[PDB]
Amino acid sequence: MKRTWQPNRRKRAKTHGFRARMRTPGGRKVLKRRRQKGRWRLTPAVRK
Amino acid sequence: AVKKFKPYTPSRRFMTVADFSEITKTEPEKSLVKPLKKTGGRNNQGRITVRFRGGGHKRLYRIIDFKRWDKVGIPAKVAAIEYDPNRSARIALLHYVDGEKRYIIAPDGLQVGQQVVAGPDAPIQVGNALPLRFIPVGTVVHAVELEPKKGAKLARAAGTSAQIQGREGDYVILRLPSGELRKVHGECYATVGAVGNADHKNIVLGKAGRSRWLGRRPHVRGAAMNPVDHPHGGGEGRAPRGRPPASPWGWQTKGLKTRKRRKPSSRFIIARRKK
RNA sequence: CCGAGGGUAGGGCCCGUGACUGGGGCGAAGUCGUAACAAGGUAGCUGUACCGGAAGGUGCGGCUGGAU
RNA sequence: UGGGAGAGGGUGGUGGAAUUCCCGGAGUAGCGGUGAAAUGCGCAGAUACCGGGAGGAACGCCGAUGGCGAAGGCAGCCACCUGGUCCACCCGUGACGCUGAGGCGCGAAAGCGUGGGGAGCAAACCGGAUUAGAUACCCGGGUAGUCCACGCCCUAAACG
RNA sequence: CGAUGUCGGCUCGUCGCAUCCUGGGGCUGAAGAAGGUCCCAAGGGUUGGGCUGUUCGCCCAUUAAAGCGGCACGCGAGCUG
RNA sequence: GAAUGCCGGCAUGAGUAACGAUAAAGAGGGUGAGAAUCCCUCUCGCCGUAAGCCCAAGGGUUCCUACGCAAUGGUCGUCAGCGUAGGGUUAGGCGGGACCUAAGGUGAAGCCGAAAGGCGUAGCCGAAGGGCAGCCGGUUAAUAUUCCGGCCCUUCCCGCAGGUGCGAUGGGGGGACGCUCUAGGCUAGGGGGACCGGAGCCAUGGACGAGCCCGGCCAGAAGCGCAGGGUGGGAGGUAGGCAAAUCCGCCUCCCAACAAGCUCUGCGUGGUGGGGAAGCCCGGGUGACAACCCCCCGAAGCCAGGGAGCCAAGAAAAGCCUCUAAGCACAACCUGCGGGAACCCGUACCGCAAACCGACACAGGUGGGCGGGUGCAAGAGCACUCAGGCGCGCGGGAGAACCCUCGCCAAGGAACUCUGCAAGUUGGCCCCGUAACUUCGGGAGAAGGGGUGCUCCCUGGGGUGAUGAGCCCCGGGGAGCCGCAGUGAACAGGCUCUGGCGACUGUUUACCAAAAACACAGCUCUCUGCGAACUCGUAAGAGGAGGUAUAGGGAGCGACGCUUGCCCGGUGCCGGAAGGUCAAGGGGAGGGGUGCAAGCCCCGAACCGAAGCCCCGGUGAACGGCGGCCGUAACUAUAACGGUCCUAAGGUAGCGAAAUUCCUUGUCGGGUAAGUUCCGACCUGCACGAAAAGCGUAACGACCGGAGCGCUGUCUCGGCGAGGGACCCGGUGAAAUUGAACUGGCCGUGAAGAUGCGGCCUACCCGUGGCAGGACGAAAAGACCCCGUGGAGCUUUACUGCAGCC
RNA sequence: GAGCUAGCCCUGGCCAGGGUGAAGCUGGGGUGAGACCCAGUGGAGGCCCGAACCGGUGGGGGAUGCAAACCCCUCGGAUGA
Ligand SMILES: [Mg+2]
Ligand SMILES: [Mg+2]
Ligand SMILES: [Mg+2]
Ligand SMILES: [Mg+2]
Ligand SMILES: [Mg+2]
Ligand SMILES: [Mg+2]
Ligand SMILES: [Mg+2]
Ligand SMILES: [Mg+2]
Ligand SMILES: [Mg+2]
Ligand SMILES: [Mg+2]
Ligand SMILES: [Mg+2]
Ligand SMILES: [Mg+2]
Ligand SMILES: [Mg+2]
Ligand SMILES: [Mg+2]
Ligand SMILES: [Mg+2]
Ligand SMILES: [Mg+2]
Ligand SMILES: [Mg+2]
Ligand SMILES: [Mg+2]
Ligand SMILES: [Mg+2]
Ligand SMILES: [Mg+2]
Ligand SMILES: [Mg+2]
Ligand SMILES: [Mg+2]
Ligand SMILES: [Mg+2]
Ligand SMILES: [Mg+2]
Ligand SMILES: [Mg+2]
Ligand SMILES: [Mg+2]
Ligand SMILES: [Mg+2]
Ligand SMILES: [Mg+2]
Ligand SMILES: [Mg+2]
Ligand SMILES: [Mg+2]
Ligand SMILES: [Mg+2]
Ligand SMILES: [Mg+2]
Ligand SMILES: [Mg+2]
Ligand SMILES: [Mg+2]
Ligand SMILES: [Mg+2]
Ligand SMILES: [Mg+2]
Ligand SMILES: [Mg+2]
Ligand SMILES: [Mg+2]
Ligand SMILES: [Mg+2]
Ligand SMILES: [Mg+2]
Ligand SMILES: [Mg+2]
Ligand SMILES: [Mg+2]
Ligand SMILES: [Mg+2]
Ligand SMILES: [Mg+2]
Ligand SMILES: [Mg+2]
Ligand SMILES: [Mg+2]
Ligand SMILES: [Mg+2]
Ligand SMILES: [Mg+2]
Ligand SMILES: [Mg+2]
Ligand SMILES: [Mg+2]
Ligand SMILES: [Mg+2]
Ligand SMILES: [Mg+2]
Ligand SMILES: [Mg+2]
Ligand SMILES: [Mg+2]
Ligand SMILES: [Mg+2]
Ligand SMILES: [Mg+2]
Ligand SMILES: [Mg+2]
Ligand SMILES: [Mg+2]
Ligand SMILES: [Mg+2]
Ligand SMILES: [Mg+2]
Ligand SMILES: [Mg+2]
Ligand SMILES: [Mg+2]
Ligand SMILES: [Mg+2]
Ligand SMILES: [Mg+2]
Ligand SMILES: [Mg+2]
Ligand SMILES: [Mg+2]
Ligand SMILES: [Mg+2]
Ligand SMILES: [Mg+2]
Ligand SMILES: [Mg+2]
Ligand SMILES: [Mg+2]
Ligand SMILES: [Mg+2]
Ligand SMILES: [Mg+2]
Ligand SMILES: [Mg+2]
Ligand SMILES: [Mg+2]
Ligand SMILES: [Mg+2]
Ligand SMILES: [Mg+2]
Ligand SMILES: [Mg+2]
Ligand SMILES: [Mg+2]
Ligand SMILES: [Mg+2]
Ligand SMILES: [Mg+2]
Ligand SMILES: [Mg+2]
Ligand SMILES: [Mg+2]
Ligand SMILES: [Mg+2]
Ligand SMILES: [Mg+2]
Ligand SMILES: [Mg+2]
Ligand SMILES: [Mg+2]
Ligand SMILES: [Mg+2]
Ligand SMILES: [Mg+2]
Ligand SMILES: [Mg+2]
Ligand SMILES: [Mg+2]
Ligand SMILES: [Mg+2]
Ligand SMILES: [Mg+2]
Ligand SMILES: [Mg+2]
Ligand SMILES: [Mg+2]
Ligand SMILES: [Mg+2]
Ligand SMILES: [Mg+2]
Ligand SMILES: [Mg+2]
Ligand SMILES: [Mg+2]
Ligand SMILES: [Mg+2]
Ligand SMILES: [Mg+2]
Ligand SMILES: [Mg+2]
Ligand SMILES: [Mg+2]
Ligand SMILES: [Mg+2]
Ligand SMILES: [Mg+2]
Ligand SMILES: [Mg+2]
Ligand SMILES: [Mg+2]
Ligand SMILES: [Mg+2]
Ligand SMILES: [Mg+2]
Ligand SMILES: [Mg+2]
Ligand SMILES: [Mg+2]
Ligand SMILES: [Mg+2]
Ligand SMILES: [Mg+2]
Ligand SMILES: [Mg+2]
Ligand SMILES: [Mg+2]
Ligand SMILES: [Mg+2]
Ligand SMILES: [Mg+2]
Ligand SMILES: [Mg+2]
Ligand SMILES: [Mg+2]
Ligand SMILES: [Mg+2]
Ligand SMILES: [Mg+2]
Ligand SMILES: [Mg+2]
Ligand SMILES: [Mg+2]
Ligand SMILES: [Mg+2]
Ligand SMILES: [Mg+2]
Ligand SMILES: [Mg+2]
Ligand SMILES: [Mg+2]
Ligand SMILES: [Mg+2]
Ligand SMILES: [Mg+2]
Ligand SMILES: [Mg+2]
Ligand SMILES: [Mg+2]
Ligand SMILES: [Mg+2]
Ligand SMILES: [Mg+2]
Ligand SMILES: [Mg+2]
Ligand SMILES: [Mg+2]
Ligand SMILES: [Mg+2]
Ligand SMILES: [Mg+2]
Ligand SMILES: [Mg+2]
Ligand SMILES: [Mg+2]
Ligand SMILES: [Mg+2]
Ligand SMILES: [Mg+2]
Ligand SMILES: [Mg+2]
Ligand SMILES: [Mg+2]
Ligand SMILES: [Mg+2]
Ligand SMILES: [Mg+2]
Ligand SMILES: [Mg+2]
Ligand SMILES: [Mg+2]
Ligand SMILES: [Mg+2]
Ligand SMILES: [Mg+2]
Ligand SMILES: [Mg+2]
Ligand SMILES: [Mg+2]
Ligand SMILES: [Mg+2]
Ligand SMILES: [Mg+2]
Ligand SMILES: [Mg+2]
Ligand SMILES: [Mg+2]
Ligand SMILES: [Mg+2]
Ligand SMILES: [Mg+2]
Ligand SMILES: [Mg+2]
Ligand SMILES: [Mg+2]
Ligand SMILES: [Mg+2]
Ligand SMILES: [Mg+2]
Ligand SMILES: [Mg+2]
Ligand SMILES: [Mg+2]
Ligand SMILES: [Mg+2]
Ligand SMILES: [Mg+2]
Ligand SMILES: [Mg+2]
Ligand SMILES: [Mg+2]
Ligand SMILES: [Mg+2]
Ligand SMILES: [Mg+2]
Ligand SMILES: [Mg+2]
Ligand SMILES: [Mg+2]
Ligand SMILES: [Mg+2]
Ligand SMILES: [Mg+2]
Ligand SMILES: [Mg+2]
Ligand SMILES: [Mg+2]
Ligand SMILES: [Mg+2]
Ligand SMILES: [Mg+2]
Ligand SMILES: [Mg+2]
Ligand SMILES: [Mg+2]
Ligand SMILES: [Mg+2]
Ligand SMILES: [Mg+2]
Ligand SMILES: [Mg+2]
Ligand SMILES: [Mg+2]
Ligand SMILES: [Mg+2]
Ligand SMILES: [Mg+2]
Ligand SMILES: [Mg+2]
Ligand SMILES: [Mg+2]
Ligand SMILES: [Mg+2]
Ligand SMILES: [Mg+2]
Ligand SMILES: [Mg+2]
Ligand SMILES: [Mg+2]
Ligand SMILES: [Mg+2]
Ligand SMILES: [Mg+2]
Ligand SMILES: [Mg+2]
Ligand SMILES: [Mg+2]
Ligand SMILES: [Mg+2]
Ligand SMILES: [Mg+2]
Ligand SMILES: [Mg+2]
Ligand SMILES: [Mg+2]
Ligand SMILES: [Mg+2]
Ligand SMILES: [Mg+2]
Ligand SMILES: [Mg+2]
Ligand SMILES: [Mg+2]
Ligand SMILES: [Mg+2]
Ligand SMILES: [Mg+2]
Ligand SMILES: [Mg+2]
Ligand SMILES: [Mg+2]
Ligand SMILES: [Mg+2]
Ligand SMILES: [Mg+2]
Ligand SMILES: [Mg+2]
Ligand SMILES: [Mg+2]
Ligand SMILES: [Mg+2]
Ligand SMILES: [Mg+2]
Ligand SMILES: [Mg+2]
Ligand SMILES: [Mg+2]
Ligand SMILES: [Mg+2]
Ligand SMILES: [Mg+2]
Ligand SMILES: [Mg+2]
Ligand SMILES: [Mg+2]
Ligand SMILES: [Mg+2]
Ligand SMILES: [Mg+2]
Ligand SMILES: [Mg+2]
Ligand SMILES: [Mg+2]
Ligand SMILES: [Mg+2]
Ligand SMILES: [Mg+2]
Ligand SMILES: [Mg+2]
Ligand SMILES: [Mg+2]
Ligand SMILES: [Mg+2]
Ligand SMILES: [Mg+2]
Ligand SMILES: [Mg+2]
Ligand SMILES: [Mg+2]
Ligand SMILES: [Mg+2]
Ligand SMILES: [Mg+2]
Ligand SMILES: [Mg+2]
Ligand SMILES: [Mg+2]
Ligand SMILES: [Mg+2]
Ligand SMILES: [Mg+2]
Ligand SMILES: [Mg+2]
Ligand SMILES: [Mg+2]
Ligand SMILES: [Mg+2]
Ligand SMILES: [Mg+2]
Ligand SMILES: [Mg+2]
Ligand SMILES: [Mg+2]
Ligand SMILES: [Mg+2]
Ligand SMILES: [Mg+2]
Ligand SMILES: [Mg+2]
Ligand SMILES: [Mg+2]
Ligand SMILES: [Mg+2]
Ligand SMILES: [Mg+2]
Ligand SMILES: [Mg+2]
Ligand SMILES: [Mg+2]
Ligand SMILES: [Mg+2]
Ligand SMILES: [Mg+2]
Ligand SMILES: [Mg+2]
Ligand SMILES: [Mg+2]
Ligand SMILES: [Mg+2]
Ligand SMILES: [Mg+2]
Ligand SMILES: [Mg+2]
Ligand SMILES: [Mg+2]
Ligand SMILES: [Mg+2]
Ligand SMILES: [Mg+2]
Ligand SMILES: [Mg+2]
Ligand SMILES: [Mg+2]
Ligand SMILES: [Mg+2]
Ligand SMILES: [Mg+2]
Ligand SMILES: [Mg+2]
């Protein structure tokens, strides 16, 4: 049957992307948090 | 008259359609249509704020001249009578001797090929628009402005009209379609006659699909819901209302008057609607 | 080949009969009231409509086959 | 061919009286209703009076034992459209006539459908009386309906 | 109660006997035939169907008879539901 | 030493289940240490509206080649989507960007919000929509509309020549649109040819043939032809298209007009460039100087912005054309021609799947296009088959029980069972024929029956041609032939009578309920005069609606027919300028503290003072409600009638043992041999009843009852057969569970159901296939039930707040 | 977090074949004119049958699955809400 993950590169970039995060106070806090933790990827990789 | 169908399906048994007899031109003026932005009942927050809306036939908005005092003195030939999906009235294409073209809503009795004009000096004839001061007492009238130069707001639906009842100072006294008696400023324009397509109210939609074509999604009774949803929700089996009948939001919906109390327009409303 | 008729299937008409039910006739020694015949105690009759335990009443229109 | 009388019919208009309701004034202790009463309305200002407005229905006098129509039926006034009918002339046609099973059309009121309208009136209904009782007659209220358009219904003491 | 799955049916039996039938008896208001009543007896047997989820029960047609109970109201790591 | 403890390691179950579609394999040759599993050949099977091909997502080197086999691969492995390495993706024309706008997003101006932020006309962004210039073939191990070859084409820049009032982000036209149906003419694709080309074949009884087999095309500028699309021309006037206008709009006049003309597209032809089969020779060579023609069928595609009809009335913007304004008119633009210039990103490969989403090489999910042939009435259905692709990554045997999927069955034919559950039956087309009832449509495929293959003969109309032959389509009549059987295989309704509920088509509990529930047209109440009511938001702003009472919100009811009674005392709502109560505030009689004082400070009565509540009315398709007792009629029984208590008023019509009836399987009738169900009645309705509508209703229903006919392995009652498992051998090898165990029966006992205690009986040691009675067998710290001054959802005339409103 | 799901918005796409045969139109009949009747033409419909496609009715299988909802048979819609 149809499952929950239906990858879509535009949808991924526009939703979780670096520019999406920077638009909003909550999103900037996500980036701030992932930099503080030392994440290698601050934002989901999507090939564009 | 309205048009009937033989019962060759279960829905054609009752379905009735407008005869479209007065209609003489079946395409709109290209320069007078713009796209109508379907909302689905959603506001700028994306929230539904009028339930059960959406999914109707695509429509183009015909620009309607609800002023007409825009062009005093300049007559116009009635070029056509057209269908308008955005209103119950038909519409009339006016070719002004100006070269300008505009739509007005079609009065009952309007004839393609006749002329109309607007202004204090306009003949008291069907299709002409005058300030209310100069229309004789007693004549029925449509597309009435509520305040001067603000546009026709009263008596715009198919078959409706207002009647001039008397004068008092700067104001004339109208009986609106609802039956309410109201003072309207005498400088407010109006068009003599009643709105056409009076058979509109005799239409039988006939099947659920017809409401859908109109953008009317199914309506759900409060009684069919659960207490999370509605005052009438819940109960085992069917239930009577078990409380004064209410809206989804709890206010009572059998008689509870809702006009704002201290509203400045009460000074101008002589007698609340009848019926 | 046709063919008495037999068989299958579906219709039509008529008759008898049926739990129960509708009124009708008659009987007469009962209960209720008194609708009509006198101006019959609300003149009557009437088509129709709505209503009432019952005769009946009322409405709308009609007739005189209505007393004074 | 020339004339007549008529609530004959259809359509659109349009007048005044009255009832009701609403607004303004003025005014107060009752009004209304009956055989007599009561319900009802009325000091939250009714009735009675003046002015203003709205709306529907019916048209006083003329009016008659009258007129018109085939019948049902038709009554303020104006206009248009339209039927029947009488008379005088004795001009035209030349029996072209009478009736009429079926057919078709028309057909009071009540009733029905769709929409409108709703003042007065009023089945149902509620109340007051009357009465032995009173699902009536009388009284106070009151919804269909009564009015208009369209479509049905097709009945009558549709009677001379 | 850190779970002992429930009515009825189907399947599969096995047991008790306070015995429905078949075998053996005494008493009889046992002439015979047929019954009644008690005693001994559990070896075997104890039908098909209509109604109802039904157990039961009523009814139809039979029968030598159409027994009553126990087995976690036997039997859902056997089925049904 | 225990916490169903935590982490890790290792056991048991066990050489057990299983090894992932029952489309299927066999042999020979080769390779190699090793081969059922890799390569090759032949044979066999499966897909073929796909299980073949192309494209888009997504994936990200998985592509190609060499060398490998530890691990990954459900076995094996020499193989591989695996390991190592090397190579591979080439564009002005394909797609996206240097173009346009859609929803939406963003957002100069502006507005709003404690902050963060929310909005917002323009503008900008935003595509799978608009716009825009490349076709065919060849080449690589691997890319190709990209490289090459041939023939075309676009834009920008510059120049030349000719032409013109040139010039825009401004005006205008255009772009520009639905659904259904559809004409003419083409093309894609297909069928046939006794014609053209071709290597060959003659078998096994016959055939040297009008024999068999194979192929018989593709692209192509200008021109030309055919078919279509689009479009009137001139003048005069002009006040509108937010400046200007010669444009567009409007008025009038003139020729034209279903024409032509002009223009644009499709198709055909077209110089030119290509391709080119079977067969047999080692992907290539040959066939071959390949031939490349005629006829038929024919689109849903093309001409196209075609046509008609209909109502639900069917984007925008840019490119483009035209108009003019500043300007500028040695410029500029337009047309032709020539030269130059022409960027960035993608391109491999998988792509209905072993490379995407599902933890897996997972029987599941995944949008667009092509999808051949024959026959079955048609078709994308079905059977077979082309091209192409596969045999599903464990095998070999065996021939038990049992299981699954399948086939048949004597006699009976629902006797099965909750139920004909399941499975039979029926089944396509043509013809005949078809009932109650009905809203006149229907019910209807009612029901029921007849026909159906092949051969010969005669003949009717159509399409294409030419009007004829040929091809193709639709028929009709006659006579025959064969079988058990002619829709001979595959695909393809069993039917009828009668109730309940819901009018109907629809919707729903993703993953236990598809229904009688929701919706639904339709009916009624009610709110709302527009800056509407109402809804979201603190607001601004939005929706409502660019709507205006024939409209919009809320509620109930639910097509349609006939209807919808009585009670307004209570609650709701509506109306009521009186009265009563009524908060802040006003008022300030009177009184108090303090000061030597002027004074400062405090308390405070009458009176005035809103909504609300009280009070007076109205209101039911507003919340709701709609009785009891005694008596009475020529026999009994009953009670039309009377009396009486109570109430706000005492249930009307209609219906009734009902989706409601406890007693109940009520009683009676019907059907049955027999009927707790069913249907028809009756009415003492425990406990129907009129828009939480009442009573009916044709048609409809994978709804729920009852009956019958047909037919059956449902059953009496079972039997046989098939394949996939189960079983045996080789390969790989789990699981929950598990205090440890050397783990029998009875009768007892025991915390009351004992392998484990007592007594007795029975019993050599260990497995294998089977069955499920026990181990109070496993699983899940019982959902029931109670308990906890545990939680949460929901309600209200519980309490107390708050929003909102007054 | 709406890449699942629910609703709406914008822009595209898809629905083999066959059947029934509404309105209208034309002709005829009818009539004072009409209504209307008949034939042809026509091609309507939350019309019918049935693939794709969308579903998920009954049963069987599966139940440490091929699968944390699948498989087979059967079944509903299939120009429309
Ligand atoms: Mg998706
Ligand atoms: Mg992904
Ligand atoms: Mg994407
Ligand atoms: Mg995308
Ligand atoms: Mg996206
Ligand atoms: Mg982003
Ligand atoms: Mg990480
Ligand atoms: Mg790093
Ligand atoms: Mg992140
Ligand atoms: Mg009209
Ligand atoms: Mg109709
Ligand atoms: Mg019709
Ligand atoms: Mg009709
Ligand atoms: Mg119907
Ligand atoms: Mg029908
Ligand atoms: Mg119409
Ligand atoms: Mg019209
Ligand atoms: Mg259009
Ligand atoms: Mg536009
Ligand atoms: Mg708009
Ligand atoms: Mg809008
Ligand atoms: Mg927005
Ligand atoms: Mg938002
Ligand atoms: Mg709303
Ligand atoms: Mg909505
Ligand atoms: Mg209109
Ligand atoms: Mg209309
Ligand atoms: Mg309506
Ligand atoms: Mg619409
Ligand atoms: Mg609605
Ligand atoms: Mg609803
Ligand atoms: Mg519910
Ligand atoms: Mg919620
Ligand atoms: Mg709540
Ligand atoms: Mg609530
Ligand atoms: Mg409730
Ligand atoms: Mg309840
Ligand atoms: Mg409920
Ligand atoms: Mg209930
Ligand atoms: Mg409920
Ligand atoms: Mg309910
Ligand atoms: Mg319900
Ligand atoms: Mg309730
Ligand atoms: Mg209620
Ligand atoms: Mg209640
Ligand atoms: Mg105002
Ligand atoms: Mg015989
Ligand atoms: Mg009398
Ligand atoms: Mg009398
Ligand atoms: Mg009398
Ligand atoms: Mg009665
Ligand atoms: Mg009585
Ligand atoms: Mg009466
Ligand atoms: Mg008379
Ligand atoms: Mg008189
Ligand atoms: Mg003479
Ligand atoms: Mg009449
Ligand atoms: Mg009348
Ligand atoms: Mg009447
Ligand atoms: Mg009235
Ligand atoms: Mg009495
Ligand atoms: Mg009535
Ligand atoms: Mg009425
Ligand atoms: Mg008379
Ligand atoms: Mg327990
Ligand atoms: Mg445990
Ligand atoms: Mg357990
Ligand atoms: Mg004897
Ligand atoms: Mg003895
Ligand atoms: Mg025995
Ligand atoms: Mg024994
Ligand atoms: Mg029984
Ligand atoms: Mg019993
Ligand atoms: Mg009994
Ligand atoms: Mg016997
Ligand atoms: Mg027992
Ligand atoms: Mg017990
Ligand atoms: Mg018990
Ligand atoms: Mg038991
Ligand atoms: Mg048991
Ligand atoms: Mg079980
Ligand atoms: Mg059991
Ligand atoms: Mg067990
Ligand atoms: Mg057990
Ligand atoms: Mg069972
Ligand atoms: Mg159950
Ligand atoms: Mg311890
Ligand atoms: Mg454990
Ligand atoms: Mg454990
Ligand atoms: Mg542990
Ligand atoms: Mg652990
Ligand atoms: Mg084992
Ligand atoms: Mg199989
Ligand atoms: Mg091998
Ligand atoms: Mg090997
Ligand atoms: Mg090989
Ligand atoms: Mg094929
Ligand atoms: Mg991946
Ligand atoms: Mg490659
Ligand atoms: Mg390996
Ligand atoms: Mg290996
Ligand atoms: Mg190695
Ligand atoms: Mg491995
Ligand atoms: Mg595997
Ligand atoms: Mg090797
Ligand atoms: Mg591999
Ligand atoms: Mg290489
Ligand atoms: Mg190139
Ligand atoms: Mg550039
Ligand atoms: Mg843009
Ligand atoms: Mg853009
Ligand atoms: Mg694009
Ligand atoms: Mg391009
Ligand atoms: Mg080209
Ligand atoms: Mg390559
Ligand atoms: Mg110019
Ligand atoms: Mg447009
Ligand atoms: Mg478009
Ligand atoms: Mg459509
Ligand atoms: Mg054609
Ligand atoms: Mg063909
Ligand atoms: Mg041609
Ligand atoms: Mg001008
Ligand atoms: Mg070749
Ligand atoms: Mg050569
Ligand atoms: Mg040669
Ligand atoms: Mg040659
Ligand atoms: Mg098609
Ligand atoms: Mg067109
Ligand atoms: Mg319309
Ligand atoms: Mg736009
Ligand atoms: Mg200048
Ligand atoms: Mg030029
Ligand atoms: Mg650049
Ligand atoms: Mg690049
Ligand atoms: Mg490539
Ligand atoms: Mg698939
Ligand atoms: Mg695909
Ligand atoms: Mg595999
Ligand atoms: Mg797969
Ligand atoms: Mg092909
Ligand atoms: Mg076939
Ligand atoms: Mg076929
Ligand atoms: Mg099929
Ligand atoms: Mg083939
Ligand atoms: Mg295989
Ligand atoms: Mg074996
Ligand atoms: Mg048999
Ligand atoms: Mg039978
Ligand atoms: Mg039989
Ligand atoms: Mg049954
Ligand atoms: Mg078949
Ligand atoms: Mg019948
Ligand atoms: Mg009929
Ligand atoms: Mg048949
Ligand atoms: Mg039938
Ligand atoms: Mg044959
Ligand atoms: Mg056959
Ligand atoms: Mg067949
Ligand atoms: Mg056969
Ligand atoms: Mg098949
Ligand atoms: Mg069928
Ligand atoms: Mg039937
Ligand atoms: Mg029943
Ligand atoms: Mg019903
Ligand atoms: Mg239904
Ligand atoms: Mg339902
Ligand atoms: Mg109904
Ligand atoms: Mg329905
Ligand atoms: Mg449907
Ligand atoms: Mg479910
Ligand atoms: Mg569920
Ligand atoms: Mg779930
Ligand atoms: Mg669920
Ligand atoms: Mg299920
Ligand atoms: Mg369900
Ligand atoms: Mg269903
Ligand atoms: Mg539902
Ligand atoms: Mg419903
Ligand atoms: Mg209704
Ligand atoms: Mg709010
Ligand atoms: Mg708010
Ligand atoms: Mg706003
Ligand atoms: Mg708005
Ligand atoms: Mg708006
Ligand atoms: Mg509106
Ligand atoms: Mg309904
Ligand atoms: Mg409903
Ligand atoms: Mg309902
Ligand atoms: Mg009826
Ligand atoms: Mg009553
Ligand atoms: Mg009340
Ligand atoms: Mg009240
Ligand atoms: Mg009262
Ligand atoms: Mg209450
Ligand atoms: Mg006073
Ligand atoms: Mg003082
Ligand atoms: Mg002191
Ligand atoms: Mg009512
Ligand atoms: Mg009450
Ligand atoms: Mg109620
Ligand atoms: Mg007596
Ligand atoms: Mg009963
Ligand atoms: Mg009933
Ligand atoms: Mg029920
Ligand atoms: Mg009951
Ligand atoms: Mg009870
Ligand atoms: Mg009972
Ligand atoms: Mg019972
Ligand atoms: Mg019984
Ligand atoms: Mg039953
Ligand atoms: Mg039952
Ligand atoms: Mg009884
Ligand atoms: Mg309700
Ligand atoms: Mg109910
Ligand atoms: Mg009710
Ligand atoms: Mg249904
Ligand atoms: Mg159903
Ligand atoms: Mg069997
Ligand atoms: Mg066999
Ligand atoms: Mg076998
Ligand atoms: Mg086998
Ligand atoms: Mg076998
Ligand atoms: Mg061995
Ligand atoms: Mg041991
Ligand atoms: Mg124990
Ligand atoms: Mg023991
Ligand atoms: Mg032992
Ligand atoms: Mg021991
Ligand atoms: Mg001991
Ligand atoms: Mg011991
Ligand atoms: Mg022993
Ligand atoms: Mg066991
Ligand atoms: Mg067991
Ligand atoms: Mg044990
Ligand atoms: Mg056990
Ligand atoms: Mg156990
Ligand atoms: Mg726990
Ligand atoms: Mg516990
Ligand atoms: Mg517990
Ligand atoms: Mg329980
Ligand atoms: Mg407990
Ligand atoms: Mg407590
Ligand atoms: Mg405690
Ligand atoms: Mg709580
Ligand atoms: Mg409110
Ligand atoms: Mg989504
Ligand atoms: Mg679109
Ligand atoms: Mg379709
Ligand atoms: Mg036809
Ligand atoms: Mg037509
Ligand atoms: Mg359909
Ligand atoms: Mg259809
Ligand atoms: Mg259908
Ligand atoms: Mg879906
Ligand atoms: Mg299923
Ligand atoms: Mg089945
Ligand atoms: Mg089976
Ligand atoms: Mg499962
Ligand atoms: Mg399946
Ligand atoms: Mg299947
Ligand atoms: Mg099927
Ligand atoms: Mg279908
Ligand atoms: Mg279809
Ligand atoms: Mg449909």
Author numbering:
A (entry chain 17): 1 to 48
B (entry chain 1D): 2 to 276
Recite the paper's sentences.
Many of currently used antibiotics inhibit protein synthesis in pathogenic microorganisms by targeting their 70S ribosomes, which are complex macromolecular machines responsible for this process. The catalytic peptidyl transferase center (PTC) located at the heart of the large ribosomal subunit (50S in bacteria) polymerizes amino acids into polypeptides in the order specified by the nucleotide sequences of the translated mRNAs. Newly-made proteins emerge from the ribosome through the nascent peptide exit tunnel (NPET) that spans the body of the large ribosomal subunit beginning at the PTC and ending on the opposite side of the large ribosomal subunit facing the cytoplasm. Here, we discover that well-known ribosomal antibiotics, hygromycin A (HygA) and macrolides, which target peptidyl transferase center and peptide exit tunnel, respectively, can act cooperatively against susceptible and drug-resistant bacteria.
To this end, we co-crystallized wild-type (WT) 70S ribosomes from the Gram-negative bacterium Thermus thermophilus (Tth) with HygA and one of the three macrolides (ERY, azithromycin (AZI), or TEL) and determined their structures at 2.5–2.6 Å resolution. In this experiment, we used Tth 70S ribosomes complexed with E. coli protein Y (PY) as a tool to obtain structures of higher resolution. Consistent with the previous structure, HygA binds in the A-site cleft of the PTC on the large ribosomal subunit with its aromatic ring sandwiched between nucleotides A2451 and C2452 of the 23S rRNA, and is oriented such that the aminocyclitol group protrudes toward nucleotide C2573, while the fucofuranose ring extends into the ribosome exit tunnel. Ribosome-bound HygA favors this rotated conformation of A2062 via direct H-bond with the N6 atom of this nucleotide.
